[PDB]
Design a binder for this molecule. Structure first.
Ligand SMILES: [K+]
Ligand SMILES: [K+]
Ligand SMILES: [K+]
Ligand SMILES: [K+]
Ligand SMILES: [K+]
Lengths: 82, 82, 82, 82
């Protein structure tokens, strides 16, 4: 896949994760964006995490859709910076 | 390996992790499924984790059997969605 | 890329992460260095994490710039030790 | 590298991580073994983590030496089980 397409795909993931955490778990937009990156990068500090059943299901969907997308995007970003 | 076989393998991992956490650590089925994905994806928030010696041993077995299986499944899922 | 260049790149990442956490979140130099490795390796214990909006933004930048760099450096280190 | 050699290398990593956490941070042998796997797999729940400067330095060394070794071992284990 072209690198710019990979960019759009991870941006879509980030929008999905951020809006979902904000509306389901009720955290601020900024916290939700931070949490989304921390989650799809697999860092997972746990300072924020879902505490409702819907949030838990949503987080599983973000894990399945986002970890692989993020991994490819960072590998591509490596090529253009190195 | 065919992608559908990889699917069955990660599903078996998920059943194993979920039933094990539920019965050993006594968390609900839903929490246990959430914890299983959080663990095999290596996100590891730590909002849930084993607090008994048997749970710790079991979690090591899930880590060894499940992280690699999950990694392959997400890579394959990437091919069919992209 | 030559392995020594990869070394310099991860060292630059480590300096960036350490100085940034120290000045933005006000933790000690030693804690900040520890946190930087824990973050770019994706271990993410969460014993330390940013609690300010600027720290959260900075941590996202470190995640994007550092996880891929660290992954390549450990793979290269594997070749020279094995 | 032959798969059996990779096995010995990760076993050496596990001994190093376990004995080090036990003696530096004073946790039990069993907790220390659990923590070692949780760390080199990059799960990093944070239910256990070093709280002394020496423990933090040691944990960085385990992160650098162990994450790559564990990754190769799980990939090899995947071949013999699948
Ligand atoms: K991780
Ligand atoms: K954590
Ligand atoms: K983690
Ligand atoms: K974590
Ligand atoms: K990889």
């Amino acid at each position: 896949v072209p690198a710019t397409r990979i960019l759009l795909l991870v941006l879509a993931v980030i929008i999905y994760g951020t809006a979902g955490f904000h509306f389901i778990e009720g955290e601020s937009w900024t916290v939700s964006l931070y949490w989304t990156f921390v989650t799809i990068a697999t860092v997972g500090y746990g300072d924020y995490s879902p505490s409702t059943p819907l949030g838990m299901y949503f987080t599983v969907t973000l894990i399945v859709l986002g970890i692989g997308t993020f991994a490819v995007a960072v590998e591509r970003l490596l090529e253009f910076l190195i």
